[PDB]
Amino acid sequence: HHWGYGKHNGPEHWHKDFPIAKGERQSPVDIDTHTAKYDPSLKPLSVSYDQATSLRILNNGHAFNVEFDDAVLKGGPLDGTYRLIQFHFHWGSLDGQGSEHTVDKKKYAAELHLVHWNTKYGDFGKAVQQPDGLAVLGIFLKVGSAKPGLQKVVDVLDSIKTKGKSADFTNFDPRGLLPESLDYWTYPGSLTTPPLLECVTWIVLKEPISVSSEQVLKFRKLNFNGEGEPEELMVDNWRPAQPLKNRQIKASFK
C-alpha cells in the first residue's frame, strides 16, 4: 500500500504514514489576495539557470521529473544559495483544475515546481531535515498560446508513459519555462508529497505561463502504473490547499 492520489491512498490518507501531514507549516495553501502583505525587504528573485545541466526524465509513478546535475536560485526572500536538483509538475483531469497552490481559490490547469536545496547543508538529503533546507519555485500553467520552452518536455512523454520508464534528457534549458515577470508570493511551508517535510521556503510566481491545450493534454496521457499492468491514467496528482495556521504570505509586489 504505497501512497498515491487515489480514493484509497490519496492526500486524505497520508497522515497515517506521515503525521506531519497535519503539521503547522503544510503546503500547498490558498493565496488570499485580500490578506497577502506587500513586504519591501523582499529582494528581486535571482534565477541563474544558464549553467543548468539536465540529465534525464523519469516517470516515477506519481509525476515525471527532470533531474539536474547539482544552476542556482538566490535573492528573493532567501539567505545564501540554492542548487537546482529537479523539476516536475502537478496537473488535472480537466483544464479547470490541477494546480496545488490556488489564488483566491482559483485553480490553474497545472503547476510547475523547480526544486532547489540550500548549499549550506551540503546535499539534498541533509537539506530536507532543516526548516530552510529547500526553496521551491512554483509557476502556474494556464491554457492559451504554446510555451516553446516546454515542447521538449511534452514531446518526450510518449517514451516514458509508464512507471519506471526514463529517457535521456540532456541539454534542456529551464529558462524556457519562466514567465516574463518574477513578481512572487512567499511563505514557509512543506513538501506537498510524502514525506511532507516542513523544510521549504515557497516562492510562487504571480504570473502564470501560458501553455497550449495540445501541450497539457500530453501530460494526461501518462500512466501511474507500470508496463503490463492495469491502466491508471496519471491525472489529478495534486494535493489540495492546507490550513495556513499562524503563517503570513508576503508579496514582493504592491
Bridge partner list, 75: 45
SS3 217: helix
Active-site annotation holds for 62: yes
Binding residues for Zn(2+): 88, 90, 113
118 binds ligand MS5 (CB under 6 A): no
Q: Which residue is nearest to ligand MS5 (CB)?
A: 193
Selected binder of ligand MS5 within 113, 116, 147, 163 (CB under 6 A): 113
CA-atom Rg of the chain in angstroms = 17
Cα separation, 203 vs 114, whole angstroms: 10
Distance of CA 199 to the CA centre of its chain: 14
Judged by CB, which is closer to ligand MS5: 24, or 214?
24
Phi, psi for 151 (deg, rounded to 5): -55, -40
Stretch that binds ligand MS5, among 39-47, 165-173, 190-198, 206-214 (CB under 6 A): 190-198
Q: How far is the CB of 63 from ligand MS5 (least distance, A)?
A: 5
67 binds ligand MS5 (CB under 6 A): yes
113 binds Zn ion (CB under 5 A): yes
Q: How far is the CB of 218 from Zn ion (least distance, A)?
A: 18
Q: How far is the CB of 164 from Zn ion (least distance, A)?
A: 10
Catalytic residue of the set 13, 62, 101, 116:
62
Residue 39, amino acid: D
SS (H, E, C) 108-143: CCEEEEEEEEEHHHCCHHHHCCCCCCEEEEEEEEEE
Stretch that binds ligand MS5, among 159-167, 189-197, 209-217, 219-227 (CB under 6 A): 189-197
25 binds Zn ion (CB under 5 A): no
According to DSSP, residue 104 is labeled T
Residue 58, amino acid: L
SS3 153: helix
Task: Give contact residues for Zn ion (rule: CB under 5 A).
Answer: 61, 113
